[PDB]
Design a protein around this nucleic acid. Structure first.
Ligand SMILES: [K+]
Ligand SMILES: [Mg+2]
Ligand SMILES: [Mg+2]
Ligand SMILES: [Mg+2]
Ligand SMILES: [Mg+2]
Ligand SMILES: [Mg+2]
Length: 95
RNA sequence: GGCCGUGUGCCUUGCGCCGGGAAACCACGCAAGGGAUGGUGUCAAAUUCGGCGAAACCUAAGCGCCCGCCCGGGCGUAUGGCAACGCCGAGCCAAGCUUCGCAGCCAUUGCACUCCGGCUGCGAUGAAGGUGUAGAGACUAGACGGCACCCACCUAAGGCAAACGCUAUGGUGAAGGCAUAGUCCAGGGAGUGGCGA
RNA sequence: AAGCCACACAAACCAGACGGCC
């Protein structure tokens, strides 16, 4: 239901039919009206397809995002989020 | 369409070998003989533009030699010619494989930051091979062609095996297609004339 | 020379390696 804090969040269950390039923008701002963003890495692999990694800058932006958007049916399809289990190779990269 | 020969290709055998492969086998120089050269299925597209190369075989302008002297001849000779055929650059190509994109759909609920699921179709693509390369050229097929598989035989790195050894993804099963089987038309057969020596 | 190129054309045959004999 919930997850441990993280400057980025994990979201699943989507209509991959979309364009990686496309979906990335259909989030770029879709998930940024309360905080900044770093990168919405997404893949189409038989593994990563159907999932994305919203990256913020501030924990809060995420703490909130994790709620101000959870369970929301994206493209006539629900949604599932969870703070990331491993702070992205961008944050844990620098700090 | 039979027999002799000439050249180029080709395989077999012998011999030589900086050589590639682990091995078989390929390659390369070369000499001599024509015994031997697997099967089914699939593809039929592109078939364009340029350039180098070239045996035998033809002809003898010039040159050399000779008929003692020019005239005229005779002898030798190819880079003049045909041509089996060896290839390059650029362009394009069926289906099979590379890899990228979209569509059925089949499956996926999957925690990542270096990409990448699977048949089917369309497009692009890359490495082969082909095309350019016939008697001018035109159209059909398919084989000796491309591709998949099967078989026979060879060696066995690797994987397997305690081990004698086992096994291909590897290798042998010619070349022909610079028109092969065909149907066309050319060309000669058999005219005229221009270049030419 | 050989050959080569134009327009013209009767056949069978020859004809897409060459030179010969039949
Ligand atoms: K072995
Ligand atoms: Mg050809
Ligand atoms: Mg052999
Ligand atoms: Mg021929
Ligand atoms: Mg023919
Ligand atoms: Mg020929």
């Amino acid at each position: 239901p919930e997850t441990r804090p993280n400057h980025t969040i994990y979201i699943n269950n989507l209509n991959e039919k979309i364009k990686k390039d496309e979906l990335k923008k259909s989030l770029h701002a879709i998930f940024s009206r309360f905080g900044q963003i770093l990168d919405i890495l997404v893949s189409r692999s038989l593994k990563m397809r159907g999932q994305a990694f919203v990256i913020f800058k501030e924990v809060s932006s995420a703490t909130n995002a994790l709620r101000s958007m959870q369970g929301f049916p994206f493209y006539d399809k629900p949604m599932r989020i969870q703070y990331a289990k491993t702070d992205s190779d961008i944050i844990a990269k620098m700090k």
